[PDB]
Amino acid sequence: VHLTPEEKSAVTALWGKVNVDEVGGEALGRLLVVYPWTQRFFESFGDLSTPDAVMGNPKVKAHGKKVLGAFSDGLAHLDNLKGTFATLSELHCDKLHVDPENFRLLGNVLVCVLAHHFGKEFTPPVQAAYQKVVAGVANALAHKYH
Amino acid sequence: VHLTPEEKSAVTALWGKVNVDEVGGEALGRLLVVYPWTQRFFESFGDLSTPDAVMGNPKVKAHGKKVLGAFSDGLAHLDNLKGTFATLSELHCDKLHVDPENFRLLGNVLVCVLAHHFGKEFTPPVQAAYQKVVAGVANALAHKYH
Amino acid sequence: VLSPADKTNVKAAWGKVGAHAGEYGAEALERMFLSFPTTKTYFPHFDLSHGSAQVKGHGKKVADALTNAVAHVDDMPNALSALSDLHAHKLRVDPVNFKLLSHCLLVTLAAHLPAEFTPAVHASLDKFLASVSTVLTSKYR
Amino acid sequence: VLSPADKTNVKAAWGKVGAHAGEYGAEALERMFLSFPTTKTYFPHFDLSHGSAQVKGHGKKVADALTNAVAHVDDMPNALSALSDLHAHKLRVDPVNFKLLSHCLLVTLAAHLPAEFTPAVHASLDKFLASVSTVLTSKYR
Ligand code: HEM
Ligand code: HEM
Ligand code: HEM
Ligand code: HEM
Incomplete structure (x- = not known):
């Protein structure tokens, strides 16, 4: 990471909010609805047919x-993002064989989920900030492939 | 890196050869001929019109x-690949603004250049080995973007 | 491809935009230039500033292009090959860059059309920009 | 797109392959499964072994598909939509995977056709597999 302190605030403050309970779903959901192929990793979640089936899907949320x-974690551990995600890396990599690409996608939809929920307040700069986290997280995960 | 020792040999021995003087060109060349957009970074090299113009182009070779x-360097410094490429990282990143993607491309054509020149000896496994270096190098370069 | 539904989901989402369309282009651009700075090595002659009558200007253009596209959905190729040639052949645009933009475009739409940015549209919409990029890069294939 | 030249460069490069075409598919697959192991999570039911009468078998298939494609170059969509549906809709294939394969395919061709793998063809050829992937993933757009 890095994040100008001016950038932390934007991330720190606009994140304090977040309907934590809802947003996680909005991302993972829209993911499996926008980039279907990811559903390959969640057949074991019930009907993922139409998106209305995906969104209201308890297993998802x-x-x-x-x-x-x-x-939340990675956000308050930017200092050491790689490591924190060590387990997860192993789990999505050498164990789940997910493509590093799909990690850029979840963070990208998430950013959209944020772009959505907060709307107007999600200034280009605030985005440019999250866009940094999203990546910095997509990489830690990626770690275990080299 | 990592490279099973079984993998080093394949890399180490099949690399000892290499028409070093020619191959570097075969890659960078085919690059700017297969993925044209990269020519944007070498307008200052003379006519890059047709590929026959690109290949025989002294500036290229x-x-x-x-x-x-x-x-060659990165190959004999897999232990610390990131750092060795620190300068280069800065040069292709915060200074030349090249997309991390184009680093996967140069290593991929290079692999093809190798796939070419050595032909039959470039067994799938030997490839899988270089395919590891090529990436491990594409990443070090990438470094300075986070 | 783009199903008869995405084409309805797009059209609607766009229709529900209006004059703002232009203003949204410019904003999407700013998001991109700030979010993915790598992309700036295409507009040196531009003052990528926050209020640049240039960024604001290009928007109006990019916008009308995406619209020209939403209007000739069942046929954008023969519509954008005008741009395809430019974007491909002349400007030599790294393809990935059509992803990044296409992203900020959706992040932007998302931040202005809260009511209709349903996952259904979102997905439908992505594909659209995806089909646009595809064509804009088709003169590479 | 694919110019009237790439289509000549492809056809030739393919013609200069022959019965080996099938054998080249299988090899390209092995290269991929070894080079990009991530891709293996698609063939669990396959013994990705070095001599697998399965990998060797799929090759024959992938090969004839790329050929079916080289034959209907001026029209692969209506040819592969058969596969497009399968690869897209049914198998849910991560698009990137069409890059990796399309790579090993060229690395493979490169390691058998030294005389004609000119940069001209190489590029021409890439585009081809690029156009193939594109179509195979077009049922995603
Ligand atoms: C920034 C990227 C991502 C983050 C933050 C993330 C995080 C996590 C976490 C923490 C878990 C819960 C594991 C547990 O504690 O039991 C998990 C599991 C999992 N993730 Fe992700 N993930 C990411 C992207 C994705 C993507 C793109 C895929 C692939 C399509 C995916 C597939 C999985 C699967 C299948 C599990 C299932 C766990 C189980 O088997 O119960 N994830 N992920
Ligand atoms: C594995 C990837 C790559 C490696 C190993 C590599 C390595 C290098 C090295 C060592 C130099 C010579 C600099 C010097 O000592 O003066 C250089 C310069 C440069 N590279 Fe690359 N490069 C890579 C990929 C690319 C790509 C994909 C592009 C972008 C299209 C590119 C664009 C440049 C440019 C423009 C220079 C010009 C140097 C000058 O201004 O004189 N390189 N690269
Ligand atoms: C979402 C898809 C896009 C659309 C619909 C679009 C549309 C346009 C339009 C209509 C113009 C104005 C053409 C004219 O006035 O003659 C233009 C020019 C240009 N586009 Fe895009 N564009 C897209 C994506 C991109 C991307 C991804 C980049 C850069 C990374 C880019 C780089 C350029 C450049 C540099 C110019 C020329 C700038 C100038 O000299 O004014 N465009 N684009
Ligand atoms: C270069 C482009 C490709 C071509 C032309 C191609 C062609 C084919 C063909 C013709 C079949 C046999 C269909 C049948 O017998 O009904 C097939 C099946 C399949 N393809 Fe591909 N394919 C390509 C790329 C890929 C990629 C990139 C993946 C995986 C990462 C993949 C995954 C599959 C799978 C898993 C099957 C089904 C396997 C089975 O159940 O036997 N293909 N492909």
Whole structure:
């Protein structure tokens, strides 16, 4: 990471809010609805047919809160982002064989989820800030492939 | 890096050869001929019109030997690949603004250049080995973006 | 491809934009230049400033292009090949850059159309910009 | 797109392959499964072994598909939509994976056709596989 302190605030303050319980789902959900191929990793979640089936899917919203959880963490551990995600890396890499790419996607939809929920306040700069975290997180995960 | 020792040999031995003077060019060249957009970074090299103009282009073959040089290095410094490329990182990143992607491309054509020149001996496994270096190098370069 | 539904989801989402469309282009651009600075090595002649009558200007243009596209959805190729040639052949635009923009475009739309940015549209919409990029880069294939 | 030249460069490069075409598919696959192991999470039911009468088998198939494609170059969409549906809709194939394969395919061709793998073809050829992937993923757009 890095984040101008001017950038932390934007991230820190605009994140303090967040319907943590809902947003995690909004991301993971929209993910499996926008980039279908990811559903390959969640057949074991019930009907993911239409998006209305995906969104209201309990199994999803449940995974979402954790996905978001893992961020909350990474957000307050930018100092050492790689390591914090060591387990997760192993889990999505040498164990789940997910493509580093799909990590840029979840962070990108998430950013959209944020772009959504907060709307107007999600200034280009605030984005440019999250856009940094999202990546910095997509990389830590990526770690275990080299 | 990592490279099973079984993997080093394949890399180490099949690399000992290499028409170092020619190959560097074969890569950088084919690069600017296969993925044109990269020519945006070498307008200052003379006519890059047709590929016959690109290949026989002295300015190119000259840059190629160095590109290959930078590998020779990275090859004998896998222990610390990131750092060795610190300068280069700065040069291709915060100074030349090249997309991390284009680093996967040069290593990929290079692999093809190798796939070419050595032909039959470039077993899938030997590739899988270089495919590791090529990446491990594409990353070090990438470094300065986070 | 783009199903008869995405084409409805797009059109609607765009229609629900209006004159703001232009203003949204400029904003999407700013987001991109700030978010993905790598992309700035294409507009040196531009003052990528926050209020640049240039960024604001290009928006109006990019916008009308995406619209020209939403209007000739069942046929953007023969519509944008005008740009395809430019973006491909002349400007030599790194393809990835069509992703990044196409992203900020959606992040932007998301931050202005809260009511209709349903996942359905979102996905539908992505594909659209995806089909646009595809074509804009088709003169690479 | 694919110019009237790439289509000649492809056809030739393919013609200069022959029965080996099938054998080249299988090899390209092995290269991929070894080079980009991530891709293996698609063939669990396959013994990705070095001599697998399965990998060797799929090759014959992938090969004839790329050929079916080289034959209907001026029209692969209506040819592969058969696969597009499968690869897209059914198998849910991560698009990047069409890059990796398309790579090993060229690395493979490069290691067998030294005389004609000119940069001209190489580029021409890439585009081809690029156009193939594009279509195979077009049922995503
Ligand atoms: C920034 C990126 C991502 C983050 C933050 C993230 C985080 C996590 C976390 C913390 C878990 C919960 C594991 C547990 O504690 O039990 C998890 C599990 C999992 N993730 Fe992700 N993930 C990411 C992207 C994705 C993507 C792109 C895929 C691939 C399509 C994916 C597939 C999985 C799967 C299948 C599990 C299932 C866990 C289980 O088997 O119960 N994730 N992820
Ligand atoms: C594995 C990836 C790559 C390696 C190993 C590599 C290595 C190098 C090295 C060592 C130099 C010579 C600098 C010097 O000593 O003067 C250099 C310069 C340069 N590289 Fe690369 N490079 C890579 C990929 C690329 C790509 C993809 C582009 C972007 C299209 C590119 C654009 C440049 C440019 C423009 C210079 C010009 C140096 C000058 O201004 O004189 N390189 N690179
Ligand atoms: C979302 C898709 C995009 C659309 C619909 C679009 C549309 C346009 C339009 C209509 C123009 C004005 C053309 C004219 O006035 O003759 C233009 C020019 C240009 N586009 Fe885009 N564009 C897109 C993506 C991109 C991307 C991703 C980049 C850069 C990374 C880019 C780089 C350029 C450049 C540099 C120019 C020329 C700038 C100038 O000299 O004024 N465009 N684009
Ligand atoms: C270069 C482009 C490709 C071509 C032309 C191609 C062609 C084919 C063909 C013709 C089949 C046999 C279909 C049948 O017998 O009904 C097939 C099946 C399949 N393809 Fe590909 N394919 C390509 C790329 C890929 C990639 C990139 C992946 C994986 C990462 C992949 C995954 C699959 C899978 C898993 C199957 C089904 C396997 C099975 O159940 O036997 N293909 N492909």
